[PDB]
From a paper:
A key step in the assembly pathway of double-stranded DNA viruses, including bacteriophage and evolutionarily related herpesviruses, is the packaging of viral genomic DNA into the procapsid. During this process, the large terminase protein docks onto the portal protein, which is embedded in the capsid wall, and translocates DNA using free energy liberated from ATP hydrolysis. Cryo-EM reconstructions reveal modifications to a canonical capsid protein fold, resulting in capsids that are abnormally large for this virus class.
Empty and DNA-filled expanded capsids appeared to be of the same size, with the diameter of the circumsphere at ∼82 nm, compared with ∼66 nm for the procapsid. Single-particle reconstructions imposing icosahedral symmetry were calculated at 4.4-Å resolution for the procapsid and 3.7-Å resolution for the expanded capsid. In the procapsid, the E loop has a relaxed conformation, with its middle section being partially disordered but with its end locked in a G-loop/E-loop “trap”, whereby the tip of the E loop is pinned beneath the G loop of a neighboring subunit.
Author numbering:
A (entry chain A): 24 to 397
B (entry chain F): 60 to 117
C (entry chain B): 235 to 397
Write the structure that this text describes.
Amino acid sequence: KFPTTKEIQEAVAAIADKFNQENDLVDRFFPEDSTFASELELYLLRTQDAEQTGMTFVHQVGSTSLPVEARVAKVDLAKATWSPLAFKESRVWDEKEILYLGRLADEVQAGVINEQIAESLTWLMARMRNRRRWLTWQVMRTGRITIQPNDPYNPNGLKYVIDYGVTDIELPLPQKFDAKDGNGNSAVDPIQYFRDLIKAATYFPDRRPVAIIVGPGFDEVLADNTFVQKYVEYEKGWVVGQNTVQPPREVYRQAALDIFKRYTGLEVMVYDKTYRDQDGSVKYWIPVGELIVLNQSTGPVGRFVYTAHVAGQRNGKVVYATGPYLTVKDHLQDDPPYYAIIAGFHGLPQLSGYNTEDFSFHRFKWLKYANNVQ
Amino acid sequence: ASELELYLLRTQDAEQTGMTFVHQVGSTSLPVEARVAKVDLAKATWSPLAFKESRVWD
Amino acid sequence: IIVGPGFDEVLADNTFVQKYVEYEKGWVVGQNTVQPPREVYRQAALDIFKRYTGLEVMVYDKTYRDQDGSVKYWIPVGELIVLNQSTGPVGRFVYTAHVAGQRNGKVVYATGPYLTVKDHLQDDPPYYAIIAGFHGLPQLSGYNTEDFSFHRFKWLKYANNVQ
């Protein structure tokens, strides 16, 4: 029954087409890249534009041309020291339960085996894709990758801390937004706050908040903000002394995202899925409250790199596979008989082109603003 | 067939996400917890109710 | 008018532009509001200006990087420049002095970007270098020959605070 490795590859290509048919924000920001190397250069360097422009030289006649300072290239002379974190696992089936399920099927052994194997393949691909998502998200929400020994996806307890060195991924806040002062009032306008971010980025071309990202519920914090309430009241045209007595809450809940999107002008792309840990909880990739925000531009950023494979090289010389590797195993001839399969590869998300004139690089930052959510 | 299985089964989503494993170099793979199809092992007890009828004329 | 940077806030602080938006969008500060927010004015400033005065407001910031690493724009913050004859190509940029050998014969020089390299790998530092450069000047479009003056474009200053 459990056979057909070439058909397993075909059905795996079908499952990958089904997985990559839909796409996500976090998937959109990083393409899939594959290298035969393993040096794991943590960031590329790419900063040469009219923001780094400079202007040319006067000279009078009769002399040699005074040379061009190219100190960005000499500053770019450095090395990249980081190590690729693999991720790999394998699902196994005991022959006892496969003859249990073969007698349970009893109409097509290889067909129900094909269905069950392809189901487990799709689920394990989902585990792979969520590993990739947790990598990319764990760096972009905190600037760096940290592995404590107590991850539900770290049973071994292997720890790693690999940093990339974004300057300030956090943002200043004197307090959260929805603190209540006076009788009942917002502490601060968020829209006027992001106006202050643009006001600070008056000079600076890469502080200006371009497009914001927040997945779960945050709208209600806006709906409680009496500044945003006042925007909605002036927008739709109600004085609480004269035109209305008290507006209701789902007005604010309806209009807050759009009035924010119009008045601040940065896009609010809301894209959360969930990750299901071992502990039974269901959390979103974004945690509730806080929100990351791009403030240079909007486009791709970084790179998800496939670190090269360790495999049987060839009969002679060395060469390796470079994509999603796939192979089957039997241990049914053995003292515990078990049928197992393995596909999960070595990889790393890389950051974008670092700035080259200085070493600083901050394109995305975040702030925490919700001391009570649920 | 007429066995009348009381429930179908289909559940594989991002609320059933899972992820890969932090494994070190050069060791054996820590394998997959197989709780899904093991907990799925059950038998259904239901029976079809056939609905049949026939008019007649005097 | 041509002006690059954020001056829309400087528009929004002008209370006549405020009262423009107040009556135009239909809000009395005595009756229909106590005070409107600042950022409706921010959203409305360039549009209320363009529909009211009726001249094309082409707003264009360009990132100007000088030697000491700070960032500016070509137009400085605040003020403006303004055309007042027509919209159309004023001026011209002239590239002169196509320098080479003068020649073995007569001067019939080329007119475009010529570039050449200079290797010096034989020398006391053995170095490699490239040259390019343009002897040039922007030539303004001259007046109609009646007067001596030519004023197609002027400006004024108001940014008594930069920030």
